[PDB]
Design a protein around this ligand. Structure first.
Ligand SMILES: C=CC(C)(C)OC[C@H]1O[C@H](O[C@@H]2C3=C([C@H](C)COC(C)=O)C[C@H](O)[C@]3(C)/C=C3/[C@@H](COC)CC[C@H]3[C@@H](C)[C@H]2O)[C@H](O)[C@@H](OC(C)=O)[C@@H]1O
Ligand SMILES: C=CC(C)(C)OC[C@H]1O[C@H](O[C@@H]2C3=C([C@H](C)COC(C)=O)C[C@H](O)[C@]3(C)/C=C3/[C@@H](COC)CC[C@H]3[C@@H](C)[C@H]2O)[C@H](O)[C@@H](OC(C)=O)[C@@H]1O
Ligand SMILES: [Cl-]
Ligand SMILES: [Cl-]
Ligand SMILES: [Mg+2]
Ligand SMILES: [Mg+2]
Ligand SMILES: [Mg+2]
Ligand SMILES: [Mg+2]
Lengths: 236, 236
């Protein structure tokens, strides 16, 4: 660990600076170093961890999709052989993306999830585990696609069960989990009906719980409810 | 050179793919590898080289400016001591930025400039040399600031002399060189009057040469003339 010699508090401070500078690779490395100090993460610290890797892998996924599209076009009828370069470079990006997902999943397994006892931390980390197996599933094609998909489903499902028992329907973590599990059903598991049912029931049950909330609360929950509505509008 | 085993043509192909995927670090590494094959670069290849490093260093500069601003605020009256972290992380970004500039300058010196005989290639590379010394000047503070500034001025000046002798006033490379030399005068050399004079004469002399051009030509020259006008509007 190249961050082993830096104070935990300094790593957190620098992660916040990297966020302000949109240096997300740095941000992720600082937060990895903070996790590796062995102490549990606070609510604010968990958000820094997830934002950093979301942006790193997000850029890798966007690049992979561009290259995969070029590759597919190059393998159609009437296309001129370009050689191995497109496949090679797509494989390079894919392998780097898989490495980042493996790193995140290793942090969750060593040892964030096992030490997370409160619902808000346990559901948060299990959602992340589902998210990063989902990203692996987006690029998987070999004899492991089915196992990767089931690993994502299993993590999302355990997070769902906890969130329904321990969190109100408007809790932003519960809402973001349901949004992403719904995307998993639609895009990964070939289950659009399940995706639509989950997004609708999640939206409706949150709607009916809004009356319990303060005003300047739940800006993140309003945002996420709109994303559920956006997906239902695209899917129906 | 980690690109030593890849074919030149494959490096160029992958640089174009990286551009489409907005993977500019990859793009720069592929183009560095292509330069290191020892053959001169075509017009299209020179553009790939400059776009790749422009985007890499551009992101580093934007991050450095964010951090430097935070650092300055932290060193004002009434500010709470945050410790060494802001300076440390600004120094980290600064050192990475300087390393990229050094790499580009080394490619120009080994051996792009010495083998560039045509005006369009020689002016192009000398403009790049001025640009990357300018980026070094933006962060320089020690006993080398003056020498760095003069290295930028010297490269821009030699490019200017060639461009005025060998290129029409509407040539896009000549125009972009004048635009950037004007920015050097304004932002680096504390010479706003020189910056304004250069931008105005460049604009006026290009205006008077437009009548020689074809229509679907010079989209890049129209774009650059507008940037000269934009700067004159900001500066006056
Ligand atoms: C990374 C730190 C920063 C940028 C400072 O904060 C990110 C954000 O962190 C919190 O928001 C979380 C959160 C996001 C909110 C939906 C953003 O809301 C607004 C108004 O922008 C998106 C972020 O990625 C983050 C951290 C992700 C999670 C997601 C994590 O799964 C493992 C589950 C849902 C969502 C929850 C955790 C949100 O509470 C806060 O409630 C947000 O504050 C506001 C104005 O709403 C803040 O923007
Ligand atoms: C990197 C390759 C790609 C993205 C394919 O092309 C970049 C661009 O490459 C060319 O444009 C150059 C060029 C740019 C043009 C001003 C862009 O014009 C338009 C319409 O977008 C900006 C680029 O950074 C680039 C390569 C940089 C230079 C600069 C280099 O200094 C060392 C000097 C001025 C300018 C010259 C070289 C331009 O000719 C072409 O003339 C442009 O084609 C069009 C539509 O105008 C193309 O967009
Ligand atoms: Cl590759
Ligand atoms: Cl640092
Ligand atoms: Mg300590
Ligand atoms: Mg615990
Ligand atoms: Mg060869
Ligand atoms: Mg030559």
């Amino acid at each position: 660990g190249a961050m082993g010699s830096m104070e935990r508090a300094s790593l957190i401070q620098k992660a916040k600076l990297a966020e302000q500078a949109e240096r997300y690779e740095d941000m992720a490395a600082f937060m990895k170093g903070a996790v590796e100090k062995g102490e549990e993460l606070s609510c604010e610290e968990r958000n820094l961890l997830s934002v950093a890797y979301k942006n790193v892998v997000g850029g890798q996924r966007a690049a992979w999709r561009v290259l995969s599209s070029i590759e597919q076009k190059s393998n159609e009828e009437g296309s001129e052989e370009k050689g191995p370069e497109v496949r090679e470079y797509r494989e390079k990006v894919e392998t780097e993306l898989q490495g980042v997902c493996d790193t995140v999943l290793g942090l969750l397994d060593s040892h964030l999830i096992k030490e997370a006892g409160d619902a808000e931390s346990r559901v948060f980390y299990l959602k992340m585990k589902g998210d990063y197996y989902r990203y692996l599933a987006e690029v998987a094609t070999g004899d492991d696609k089915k196992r990767i998909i089931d690993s994502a489903r299993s993590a999302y499902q355990e997070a769902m069960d906890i969130s329904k028992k321990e969190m109100p329907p408007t809790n932003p973590i519960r809402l973001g989990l349901a949004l992403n599990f719904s995307v998993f059903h639609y895009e990964i598991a070939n289950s659009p009906e399940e995706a639509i049912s989950l997004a609708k029931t999640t939206f409706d049950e949150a709607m009916a719980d809004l009356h319990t909330l303060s005003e300047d609360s739940y800006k993140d929950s309003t945002l996420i409810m709109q994303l559920l509505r956006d997906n239902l509008t695209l899917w129906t």
